[PDB]
Amino acid sequence: SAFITFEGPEGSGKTTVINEVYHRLVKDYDVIMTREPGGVPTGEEIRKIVLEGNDMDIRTEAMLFAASRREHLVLKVIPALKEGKVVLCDRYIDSSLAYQGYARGIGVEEVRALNEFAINGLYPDLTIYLNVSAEVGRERIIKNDQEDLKFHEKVIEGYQEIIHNESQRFKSVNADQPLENVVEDTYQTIIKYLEK
Amino acid sequence: SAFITFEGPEGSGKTTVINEVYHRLVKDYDVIMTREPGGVPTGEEIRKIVLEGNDMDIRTEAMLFAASRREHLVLKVIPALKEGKVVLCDRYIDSSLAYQGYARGIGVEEVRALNEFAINGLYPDLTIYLNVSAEVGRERIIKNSDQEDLKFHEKVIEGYQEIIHNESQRFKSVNADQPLENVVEDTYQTIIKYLEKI
């Protein structure tokens, strides 16, 4: 079994990459695509709070993302891994570190301590980082304001810091290239890991 | 201002004590009494998830108690402390430490790290611990309102003892084995000595 997470800001081609890689992996592996809360009842209710929430305190929001993460991990991810599945998970711990920790200003290590409580040692076996420049990412967003532009840059800066410190499970894919190549590089990286 | 929390297992008479003590304190201090979620909408919606939980994972439950704690602290406690009020809170971080950490088995230090993210340095100035023996506690439950319930009750008490041993300075342990009139009086007097020394 394998627990593979996908990380990157918006405009990184993440949705296209997961769907295309899923279609290629299904030939050889029992594979699933998922994202938090991913249909888990408690997680869905938490997501309703987050999405109905107005001016929510950033720490409360971080704790809700971590609570939906745990529900999705315990009721979806772990049973799938137990079945021998390759789990392709859209966003996990690193999204909270880059968005809540870095971009929102809580502190990466403070958001890490929170998410280590939530995942309780269950780190991904492999994490694909779709390394897009802010400029290409910004262009893909308009295809698919000032505060939004700067928040997007801060998210990327956050991801740079996370990938700088930890580089074992992390595999950076050049997401500035056309999506066909981003898909191919992501596919080859996954196969190399799975076949090892 | 002062942030005073109230802790204890069920059967310690905690609700009864806090109500009576608050009623006496209102006569001399600008004081509010609250508990989580305490009407804060997001906290109330979180409370509904906790209660609707079917064999909920203990870590998710702990994070929901901590998110409810943040909302209640941010919207009710901190603004009252900024207005110079005395804030009496029925259950706070130590309830998570004792129930989720010790009795549920997540570990006190792990639940403490979660709750330190939630409270962001805002520990109580004083914590009243209603120190009821497991035997008096057991009997009081049967009068106010099995083997598994008794064991969890003993574990909650053992947990609070562990927390108090490691952080004695913040706590004031009140004999909760004595009649409720006496528990109220000792709790009220402990709070007065603290309030008149600030």
Ligand SMILES: Cc1cn([C@H]2CCCN(Cc3ccc(C(=O)O)c(Oc4cccc(Cl)c4)c3F)C2)c(=O)[nH]c1=O
């Ligand atoms: C997983 C995750 C995502 N995000 C971001 C990722 C980029 C998009 N934003 C906004 C957004 C967009 C859509 C939804 C949406 O799902 O409609 C959404 O709600 C949730 C997404 C995941 C979990 C939860 Cl509890 C809510 C959301 F916050 C969330 C974080 O800030 N932190 C995390 O840990």
Ligand SMILES: Cc1cn([C@H]2CCCN(Cc3ccc(C(=O)O)c(Oc4cccc(Cl)c4)c3F)C2)c(=O)[nH]c1=O
């Ligand atoms: C504050 C707190 C309380 N408890 C216990 C205290 C003893 C009673 N139980 C059960 C209980 C009883 C009533 C309610 C109730 O409020 O009806 C309740 O729901 C909540 C109480 C506080 C916060 C939240 Cl999110 C839910 C509850 F869990 C919870 C914990 O285990 N951890 C904590 O952090």
